[PDB]
Design an enzyme around this catalytic site. Structure first.
Site, mmCIF file in Angstrom:
data_model
loop_
_atom_site.group_PDB
_atom_site.id
_atom_site.type_symbol
_atom_site.label_atom_id
_atom_site.label_comp_id
_atom_site.label_asym_id
_atom_site.label_seq_id
_atom_site.Cartn_x
_atom_site.Cartn_y
_atom_site.Cartn_z
ATOM 1 N N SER A 102 48.310 -2.632 14.516
ATOM 2 C CA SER A 102 47.997 -1.103 14.946
ATOM 3 C C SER A 102 46.547 -0.840 15.306
ATOM 4 O O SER A 102 45.912 -1.607 15.652
ATOM 5 C CB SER A 102 47.869 -0.821 12.992
ATOM 6 O OG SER A 102 46.591 -0.649 12.419
ATOM 7 N N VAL A 103 46.332 0.114 15.357
ATOM 8 C CA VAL A 103 45.193 1.027 15.757
ATOM 9 C C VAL A 103 44.009 0.651 14.854
ATOM 10 O O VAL A 103 42.855 0.921 15.558
ATOM 11 C CB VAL A 103 45.346 2.655 15.746
ATOM 12 C CG1 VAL A 103 45.682 2.919 14.116
ATOM 13 C CG2 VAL A 103 44.624 3.642 16.448
ATOM 14 N N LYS A 104 43.786 0.141 13.922
ATOM 15 C CA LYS A 104 43.519 -0.136 12.283
ATOM 16 C C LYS A 104 42.097 -1.043 12.529
ATOM 17 O O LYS A 104 41.453 -1.371 12.407
ATOM 18 C CB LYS A 104 43.885 -0.016 11.374
ATOM 19 C CG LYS A 104 44.127 1.156 10.599
ATOM 20 C CD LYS A 104 42.734 2.274 10.652
ATOM 21 C CE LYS A 104 43.355 3.638 9.774
ATOM 22 N NZ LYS A 104 44.875 3.761 9.730
ATOM 23 N N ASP A 105 42.408 -1.697 14.268
ATOM 24 C CA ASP A 105 41.798 -3.054 14.167
ATOM 25 C C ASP A 105 40.074 -2.737 14.892
ATOM 26 O O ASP A 105 38.935 -3.510 14.331
ATOM 27 C CB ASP A 105 42.722 -4.188 15.385
ATOM 28 C CG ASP A 105 44.102 -4.608 14.716
ATOM 29 O OD1 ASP A 105 44.223 -5.076 13.833
ATOM 30 O OD2 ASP A 105 44.223 -5.500 15.885
ATOM 31 N N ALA A 126 38.480 -1.475 11.981
ATOM 32 C CA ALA A 126 37.639 -2.484 10.705
ATOM 33 C C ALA A 126 36.871 -3.587 11.046
ATOM 34 O O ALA A 126 36.379 -4.208 10.677
ATOM 35 C CB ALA A 126 39.656 -3.371 10.769
#
Lengths: 331, 331
Positions: free
Chosen positions: B40-43, B46
């Site tokens: 996902s985009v959250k990498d 993060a």
């Protein structure tokens, strides 16, 4: 800027495997095939198989691709098919999990469920799919082909032309050894051909699970598939057309517990959560590195993510029943 | 030849969206954030959140990252944590996607499920996680930090420095418009900043689901939310620190049925099976392209895979109950 999702297949990165490298005094890398848009190595064969059928005129828009598979091949074929305007008919044993059925139906595959059967039975999903394609081609105006992943050598060709060349490029000519497990054999046989063309001194190893016949065959000539493995995507019991002419320089038989111990540690220590075949492959890379000695560059394949094996491979109850290691963090 | 899985974060490709492009006379691309290793985009956030804490000396090996999240932030954080030697404590609403819960447990997050609650309620997962970080910091010698994705502006910084620069580079300076939905606001606000620095009359749009308050705020000056949405990862009720200073040039409110209609067609027609927010985003991209006129280049974000939502978003029983469209091929 790419014209479709298909342009994102391939050119996957090499990820240094730090334990394995440290243990062996070698630089060991895993090729991140899970970063294909179909989320496995099978995107490559799926692309080549369908493009080949196109090039030969056996598929026109709206045509159908048949394959017997409860694995990544079904996923890869269906994604490519949808991107190019085709349909898939995936023959699958009715005993397969609802999960595997749902993963295929999600993408738009039409499932043809059949009672399960051994490969000697002509109604086995693999052999049946060939006859289904022949029948369908009579009533499908836009064609119907059998992907035939095991014996279709454009499978091997994908890896000659893409995987091998990427590896050569990304190691800047320095790769000394390559190791992979075998389902169809496309990955190992094709990558071997491509790599050895570039440098004939590159060593090729087979990493083989229990229940497969290939280790015994290449090492002693015996015909024999002893034991069993909970790994999926790999474990071959005949010399497929993709394997023709292939002989490995080294062959390693990897028990499930060795693969899983590596796989589970990889999650904890390196933030990689991969499928069972990746544990087999990394175990093989460690053994190849130990045979060659320190100071070599070894590449293997990280074939897919672990997520879709969570009901067995990452399930404590299942693993304990099989007398296999359990992930410490799931206790 | 990369050093760890963290090197594969970002540099995601732009994929042309053919139906959206044909419809608008524009070249409309979706940035494939699903091809990050955490899927996902959250990498991006993060990575930046954890590295930031490291640089400030607040984390050392064995330390713990605490976060309140709907799932993807927890997944990204846990992958990065494991790659770098940290633990995660993830506070998640009971109502979260089962698939995201499964991914979190597999990756080794310490998962703390709490009842769903509005943000005004102090036991809301986000506010709760802040107090847990404060509690844990007292007894974690290696450090305990609050990831705090909603108000930690290294989130926004990640997209300024990576996402935006990639888009500018990969469109070879030709991008005219960017659209995205908002959860923390990091993606939209950060990408807008980076792009507008490179070309100040690039236009920026918000795509807002029902139940979110931002469309009302930007168009009327009042934070007002009405209705609800089954989309996850998006739907914001306040101006987060990541949203400070952001003003969209255009704002669109997108109903679930519009987003789903696009998503389901995308699977069948273009081989892309994406999460709910991607449908919202592509709906916004179409509307932005129409506001800018033909001949423009529009970019949006494809945030994660549809398989992460299979039990709701692609589940006929669920969708019928919510009075929403059902994927045709699910029969």
């Amino acid at each position: 800027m790419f014209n479709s999702v298909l342009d994102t297949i391939g050119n996957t990165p090499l990820i240094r495997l730090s334990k394995a490298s440290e243990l062996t005094g070698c630089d060991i890398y895993g090729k991140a095939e899970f970063l294909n848009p179909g989320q496995s190595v099978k995107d490559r064969a799926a692309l080549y198989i369908i493009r080949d059928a196109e090039k030969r005129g056996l598929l026109r828009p709206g045509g159908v691709i048949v394959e017997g598979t409860a694995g990544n091949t079904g996923i890869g074929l269906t994604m490519v098919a949808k991107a190019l305007g085709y349909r898939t008919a995936i023959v699958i044993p009715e005993t397969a999990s609802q999960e595997k059925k749902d993963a295929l139906r999600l993408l738009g595959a039409e499932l043809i469920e059949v009672p399960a059967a051994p490969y000697r039975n002509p109604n086995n999903a693999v052999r049946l799919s060939g006859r289904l394609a022949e029948q369908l081609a009579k009533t499908e105006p836009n064609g119907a082909i059998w992907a035939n992943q095991f014996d279709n050598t454009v499978n091997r060709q994908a890896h000659i032309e893409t995987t091998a060349q990427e590896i050569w490029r990304d190691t800047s000519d320095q790769i000394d050894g390559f190791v992979a497990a075998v389902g169809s054999g496309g990955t190992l046989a094709g990558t071997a051909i491509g790599l050895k063309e570039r440098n004939h001194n590159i060593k090729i190893a087979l990493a083989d699970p229990h229940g497969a016949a290939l280790h015994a065959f290449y090492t002693t000539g015996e015909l024999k598939a002893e034991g069993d493995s909970i790994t999926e995507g790999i474990g071959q019991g005949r010399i497929t057309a993709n394997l023709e002419g292939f002989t490995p320089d080294f062959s390693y038989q990897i028990p499930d517990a060795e693969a899983l111990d590596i796989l589970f540690a990889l999650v904890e220590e390196e933030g990689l959560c991969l499928g069972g075949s990746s544990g087999i492959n990394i175990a093989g890379a460690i053994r190849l590195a130990k045979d060659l000695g320190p100071g070599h560059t070894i590449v293997t394949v990280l074939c897919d993510y672990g997520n879709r094996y969570q009901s067995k491979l990452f399930n404590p109850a299942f693993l304990r029943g099989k007398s296999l290691p359990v992930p410490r963090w799931l206790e």
